[PDB]
């Protein structure tokens, strides 16, 4: 049994465990037979080309299906009266009721609406015709081919880079900062100024005329002579670079000329930043030299050894990358609703809900994975000798202080936050809603006031943003923060207080599980030699009291539940606060979010009505029938996860042995024999499969609920506003 070829341990297994574990360990390239360090980095570099190519093929498919089956040009002519189309439906299982429910009014056939926001992205970038979308689709498929060729080419023996090339940290940082961040942002500022801003002006600039179309009438003469204010001046032609600040009151979105100036300003910062480190020209910083100098008296050896720790551990590098991506992904979610960039996207409420929820769940997975590879680092790559007394080894040295205080904060938050919700629920039940514990969120209102929100009893400490940000942006910023129908610093009250501490509970508890798993990854009192067993192993048996879920992998598994719970609390709160805004029901949110029955009744029960009426014996089907079916599907998958999570292996293995008996004794069927002996799934596999069903069922249920409740009850809104002075 030669599959899997990378593991002769697995390949000689005569059971069905050979197939499952070959799949599960296929991308764990470090643990494969015959792997060297150099061949690992060469395989990764080419694998990363393949992943890049998949991203561009995915984007070209979205572009093709919107161009070929969508209604982009019909939507461009009428952005309020036209629902954007993702792709057509051809499903032979459809009856006549389903075909007409998905066929839009006057339409040719059944289609899916689009909630990815791609139309608003394509329109804001300046695309106006289907030929724009089709040429994007071809270009990304060609770009995908180039990366596939590059990955293949850099596996050829003349082009495989050396291990010293992959470990040249200083050159990679200089190139990724200056070109991959800086020049790419500079190029995007070029697209905005040459293409997207003239398209917003109504001037079609494309490849056929952009060489002979000045983006500014004075073109490039103010740039080189240092007279840069001409690009901001309305009397010297339409401006291309401004700092108005705030949101455009006609659109409710960011100023395009602000977006262009933003990407130009940060391009200069990133290009300058990528001149910091020492490559082959004598000048620049050695990263090892910077880290070794930063050694103070309280933190022992400081950062000495951390260069060779990070540069020789891919799991450390990946954990740092995942954590930073996860923070930035959350920041994308928080700033996309608060400061939207895309024309007609704040008016599409379903898209704003879908995008916030998508990116917060992605950020939650990236955060858990960052700590997972931090735990893998400690078992596989952490050398205590080369990290002697530095800041890394000192974390492990006071790890009982870290875990016990994280345990304290989570219990401190959890006892009182739950206690306050329960207090308010009992008050509402007994007819005493004026005896609720309603705590005013004055520390966060303090933050809003420092940015120029006018809130009566809360002081501007330094004197307000007139003192603290006296820039050119200040009039447009203050006009957008104090305006009605403006998403910047939403009004908050006691319901916002309680859920923010519930969120802080979920953040501290998920961190506690992840940090304890990463810090007890190498060993504990119950298992002092745990690093000799690895990241993922079932247990150490029933001795010493019993040791189920003792591995660092099992702490990942436990924290996924807590991450899903925390992001659930975050996205429930975003959705209910915004559908109360969109639905003109903010007073209901402020009244009912302070106790948990209000969340059950006014959020979950009330907004389930269009969803579960998506198909019915009385009224047939409508467009929500697919979300209604997915909503039930998600409940089924989630509940199926419970079977794997609760009923553990030895039950199933004894059950399978009777089935093995039955097959071998049944006439006409015992002539057919398995090649691999049926066994129950392993202990770790049962946890993983149970977590997978739990997670998939969690996400599909909420996505069906979030989309169908928003698209039926709160689909559209104005998003224009009157600025405040």
């Amino acid at each position: 049994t030669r599959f899997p070829k990378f593991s002769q341990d697995l390949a000689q297994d005569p059971t069905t465990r050979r197939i499952w574990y070959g799949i599960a360990t296929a991308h764990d390239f470090e643990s494969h037979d015959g792997m060297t360090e150099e061949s690992l980095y060469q395989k990764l570099f080419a694998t990363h080309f393949g992943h890049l190519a998949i991203i561009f093929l995915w984007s070209s498919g979205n572009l093709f299906h919107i161009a070929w089956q969508g209604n982009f040009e019909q939507w461009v002519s009428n952005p309020t009266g036209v629902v954007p189309i993702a792709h057509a439906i051809w499903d032979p299982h459809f009856g006549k009721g389903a075909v007409e429910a998905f066929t839009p009014e006057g339409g040719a056939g059944p289609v899916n609406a689009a909630y990815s926001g791609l139309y608003y992205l394509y329109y804001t970038l300046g695309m106006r015709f289907n030929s724009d979308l089709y040429q994007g689709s071809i270009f990304l498929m060609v770009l995908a081919t180039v990366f596939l060729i590059a990955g293949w080419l850099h596996l050829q023996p003349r082009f495989r880079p050396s291990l010293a090339w992959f470990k040249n940290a200083e050159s990679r940082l200089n190139h990724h900062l200056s070109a991959l961040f800086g020049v790419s942002s500079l190029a995007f500022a070029g697209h905005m100024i040459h293409v997207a801003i003239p398209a917003a002006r109504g001037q079609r600039v494309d490849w056929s005329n952009f060489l002979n179309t000045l983006p500014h009438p004075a073109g490039l003469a103010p740039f080189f002579t240092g007279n840069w204010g001409v690009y901001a001046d309305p009397q010297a032609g339409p401006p291309i670079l401004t700092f108005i600040g705030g949101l455009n009151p006609a659109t409710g979105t960011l100023w395009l000329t602000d977006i262009a100036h933003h990407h130009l300003a940060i391009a200069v910062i990133f290009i300058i930043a990528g001149h910091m480190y020492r490559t082959n020209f004598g000048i620049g910083h050695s990263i090892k030299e910077i880290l070794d100098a930063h050694k103070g008296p309280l933190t022992g050896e400081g950062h000495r050894g951390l260069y060779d720790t990070i540069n020789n551990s891919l799991h450390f590098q990946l954990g740092l990358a995942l954590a930073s991506l996860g923070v930035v992904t959350s920041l994308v979610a928080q700033h996309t609703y608060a400061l939207p960039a895309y024309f007609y996207m704040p008016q599409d409420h379903t898209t704003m809900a879908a995008l916030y929820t998508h990116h917060q769940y992605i950020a939650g997975f990236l955060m858990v994975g960052a700590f997972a590879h931090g735990a893998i680092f400690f078992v596989r790559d952490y050398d205590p000798k080369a990290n002697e007394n530095n800041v890394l080894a000192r974390m492990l040295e006071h790890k009982e202080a870290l875990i016990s205080h994280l345990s304290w904060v989570s219990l401190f938050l959890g006892f009182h936050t739950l206690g306050l919700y329960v207090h308010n629920d009992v008050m509402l039940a007994f007819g005493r809603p004026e005896d609720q514990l309603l705590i005013e969120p004055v520390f966060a209102q303090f933050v809003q006031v420092q940015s120029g929100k006018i809130i009566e009893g809360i002081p501007a400490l330094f004197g307000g943003p007139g003192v603290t940000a006296p820039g050119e942006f200040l009039t447009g910023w203050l006009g957008s923060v104090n305006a009605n129908n403006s998403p910047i610093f939403l009004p908050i009250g006691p319901g916002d207080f309680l859920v923010h501490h519930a969120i802080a509970l979920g953040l501290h508890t998920t961190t506690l599980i992840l940090v304890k798993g990463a810090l007890d990854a190498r060993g504990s009192k119950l298992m002092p030699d745990k690093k000799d067993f690895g990241f993922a192993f079932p247990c150490d048996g029933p001795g010493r009291g019993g040791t189920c879920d003792i591995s660092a992998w099992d702490a990942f598994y436990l924290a996924v539940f807590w991450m899903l719970n925390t992001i659930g609390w975050v996205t429930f709160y975003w959705h209910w606060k915004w559908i109360s805004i969109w639905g003109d029901n903010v007073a209901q949110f402020n009244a009912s979010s302070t106790y948990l029955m209000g969340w059950l009744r006014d959020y979950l029960w009330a907004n389930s009505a269009p969803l579960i009426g998506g198909y019915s014996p009385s009224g047939g089907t409508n467009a929500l029938s697919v979300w209604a079916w997915m909503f039930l599907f998600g409940h089924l998958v989630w509940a199926t996860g419970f079977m794997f999570l609760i009923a553990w292996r030895g039950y199933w293995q004894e059950l399978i042995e009777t089935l093995v008996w039955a097959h071998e004794r049944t006439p006409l069927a015992n002539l057919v024999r398995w090649k691999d002996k049926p066994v129950a799934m392993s202990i770790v596999q049962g946890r993983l499969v149970g977590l997978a069903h739990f997670t998939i069922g969690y996400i599909l249920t909420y996505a069906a609920f979030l989309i169908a409740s928003t698209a039926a009850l709160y689909p559209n809104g104005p998003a224009a506003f009157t600025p405040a002075i």
């Binding site: 080419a46 694998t47 289907n130 089709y134 081919t145 596939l148 050829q156």
Partner: peptide, 29 residues
Amino acid sequence: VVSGAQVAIAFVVALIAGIAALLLSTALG
């Protein structure tokens, strides 16, 4: 619109990406 010629062109570009993916996936294995 996306005419029938442009659908056919897109599948030819997709076929070339397919053989490129075939080159990479066998060099990776």
